[PDB]
Amino acid sequence: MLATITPVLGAAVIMMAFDRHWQTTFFEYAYGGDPILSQHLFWFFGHPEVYVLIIPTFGFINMIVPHNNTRRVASKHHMIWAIYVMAYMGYLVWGHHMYLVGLDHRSRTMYSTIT
C-alpha cells in the first residue's frame, strides 16, 4: 500500500513546494489551479496511510490470542481476505475526508457508499 501511495504523496508535496517558492500557481484558482486538487492528492495518500498504520495490530492480536489459547485462529484465510479487501477499498474512500469542500454529489455518494 505504501508502495502505491508514496509517489502520489511525493508529487503532492513537490507541487506544494513549487507553488510556495516558484509561484507555479498549481493551487491558485485565478489562472487555472485548484486547492481541491491538493486535497485530493493528499487524501489519496491519506486514508491508505491510516490503513497502513492500523492493520499490523490485527496481526499482533491474531498471533497473541491463538498462542495463549493453544488453538488455531478462527479463519485466517478469511481474515487475510478481509484485510486485503480493506486495502482495496482504501483507494476509493479517500474522499470521505472531503465531504464539505464542495465535491460533486456523484463522487460524494461514491465515497460514502464505499466507506
Binding site: 484558482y29 485565478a30 485548484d34 486547492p35 481541491i36 464539505l100 469542500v101 464542495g102
Partner: protein
C-alpha cells in the same frame, strides 16, 4: 487590440424575451422590427469606458466583539449642528424598559470585565467569550435561503453546530447551499477550518426570525443601506418604509 472597426453589423438576438410572446425586442420609428444594427466607431484613438459596476450589495461585516474603553452615552444633535439636542445613558431593564441609568455604566462594564461570578455549570447563553460578534446575520425562518459560500483568501468553514451544518468556504468555488431553518433561533458558530492566527476567534451569529421581525430588521437596518440616497431619515429610511411594503 487592433481597432474598433469603422462599421460593425450586429445581429439582434431573437427570443431573448418571452414576456408577451414577442421575439423582436427592437422596433424602429417606422414601426418595423429590426434584425440588424449598425455600430460606428467615431474616434479611433479614444479609449473605451470601463464597464460600470451595476452590482449593489448590503454588506454586513461580522467581526469579533471589541472591548469598549468607556461606555459612551446616547447623544443626538439638532437638525452638523454639534449642539447636543439630547444626551442620556439608557440601560435596558428587566421589564424591557430603556430606563435612565442611575449608576456609572463604565464602572459596571469594568466590574463585569474584571470579576464576574461564574459556576461549574454556567449555560453557554450566559457565558460567551469566543462567540461574541458586533453584527448578526438575520434571516427569515421556515423559508429557503440560497447561501453562496466563497472565501477571499483561504479555506474557511462556516460552521453552525445548532443547525448541524458546515459550509467549506473555498476560494474560487462559488458553492451554492440550501439553507432552511424550521425554528426561531439564535445560533452561534465558529470557523471550523484552520486558517491561521485568529482561527479560534472567528465567531458567527445567525438569527433566524419570523418573517415579520426579519422584515422589520430588513427595513430598519438593511433597506436603509443599499439605497444610495442622502443619510437623512426623511429621505431614505422612511422613504423605503413608505415606498416598498410587503
Amino acid at each position: 487590440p487592433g481597432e474598433v472597426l469603422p462599421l460593425r453589423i450586429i445581429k439582434y438576438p431573437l427570443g431573448l424575451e418571452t414576456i408577451h410572446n414577442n421575439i423582436f425586442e427592437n422596433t424602429n420609428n417606422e414601426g418595423n422590427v429590426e434584425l440588424f444594427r449598425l455600430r460606428f466607431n467615431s474616434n479611433s484613438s479614444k479609449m473605451q469606458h470601463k464597464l460600470v459596476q451595476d452590482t449593489i450589495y448590503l454588506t454586513l461585516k461580522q467581526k469579533r466583539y471589541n472591548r469598549k474603553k468607556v461606555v459612551a452615552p446616547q447623544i443626538k444633535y439638532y437638525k452638523k449642528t454639534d449642539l447636543v439636542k439630547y444626551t442620556g445613558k439608557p440601560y435596558l431593564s428587566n421589564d424591557k424598559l430603556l430606563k435612565q441609568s442611575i449608576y456609572d455604566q463604565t464602572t459596571q462594564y469594568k466590574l463585569i470585565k474584571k470579576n464576574k461570578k461564574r459556576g461549574e455549570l454556567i449555560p453557554v447563553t450566559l457565558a460567551r467569550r469566543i462567540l461574541r460578534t458586533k453584527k448578526t446575520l438575520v434571516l427569515p425562518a421556515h423559508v429557503n435561503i440560497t447561501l453562496i459560500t466563497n472565501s477571499y483568501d483561504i479555506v474557511h468553514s462556516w460552521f453552525i453546530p445548532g443547525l448541524g451544518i458546515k459550509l467549506d468556504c473555498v476560494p474560487g468555488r462559488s458553492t451554492h447551499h440550501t439553507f432552511f431553518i424550521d425554528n426561531v433561533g439564535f445560533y452561534y458558530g465558529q470557523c471550523a477550518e484552520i486558517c491561521g492566527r485568529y482561527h479560534h476567534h472567528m465567531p458567527i451569529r445567525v438569527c433566524a426570525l419570523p418573517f415579520e421581525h426579519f422584515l422589520l430588521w430588513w427595513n430598519t437596518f438593511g433597506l436603509p443601506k443599499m439605497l444610495n440616497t442622502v443619510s437623512r431619515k426623511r429621505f431614505e429610511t422612511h422613504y423605503e418604509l413608505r415606498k416598498y411594503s410587503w
